[PDB]
Amino acid sequence: SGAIYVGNYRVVNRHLATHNDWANLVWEDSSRDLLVSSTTAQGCDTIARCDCQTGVYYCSSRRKHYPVSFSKPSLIFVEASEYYPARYQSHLMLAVGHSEPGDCGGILRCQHGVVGIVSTGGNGLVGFADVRDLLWLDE
Ligand SMILES: NC(=O)[C@H]1CCCN(C(=O)Cc2cccc3nsnc23)C1
Ligand SMILES: [Zn+2]
């Protein structure tokens, strides 16, 4: 679990969105596993606007932050689950590192700010849904 709070927005994994997230929907994309809902309270997370390929992510299954090199946002094949059939997930970045299903929502950050959130994993790899291209999160 986990979310990004920026201005009047809350960004979560789409497969983990609540009834309240859907009742206050701003934008959602199944192919990216992202959902953004509106919030009354003001968020103060800074989103990065960069092309970094190094950062630090939070791994709740180990209660630790890990430094990682990660790939550029791309279309990557993802196995079926109770949330999606087998498909390509776009805007996805991979790194060598530990993750478990409950790790989704953990933030990936670089020196510029929030890069994305954990969205997939397995076989010693962790996948992050990128948010740096969503320029509207700031306005
Ligand atoms: N975006 C998707 O389609 C997700 C939806 C939930 C299931 N999923 C996973 O990757 C499950 C998983 C297993 C093993 C380590 C994991 N670390 S994070 N998620 C992990 C795919
Ligand atoms: Zn950066």
Side-chain angles (χ1 to χ4, degrees), residues 15 33 78 81 83-84 87 89 99-101 104 118-122:
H15 72 279
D33 183 44
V78 180
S81 64
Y83 321 102
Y84 305 111
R87 83 223 203 273
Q89 173 160 323
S99 72
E100 293 175 49
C104 286
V118 177
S119 170
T120 68

Side-chain angles (χ1 to χ4, degrees), residues 48 50-52 54 110-113 115 132:
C50 66
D51 78 350
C52 284
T54 67
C110 65
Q111 58 181 128
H112 311 101
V115 172
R132 303 176 278 184

Side-chain angles (χ1 to χ4, degrees), residues 2-14 16-29 34-43 134 136-137:
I4 305 162
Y5 293 97
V6 52
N8 293 311
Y9 296 124
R10 163 176 144 92
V11 190
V12 278
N13 294 88
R14 192 195 186 272
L16 297 180
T18 68
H19 293 282
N20 187 70
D21 284 322
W22 277 100
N24 292 296
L25 179 66
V26 168
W27 169 81
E28 56 74 27
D29 191 340
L34 294 184
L35 181 147
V36 176
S37 53
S38 55
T39 70
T40 52
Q42 179 79 5
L134 308 178
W136 52 269
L137 289 177

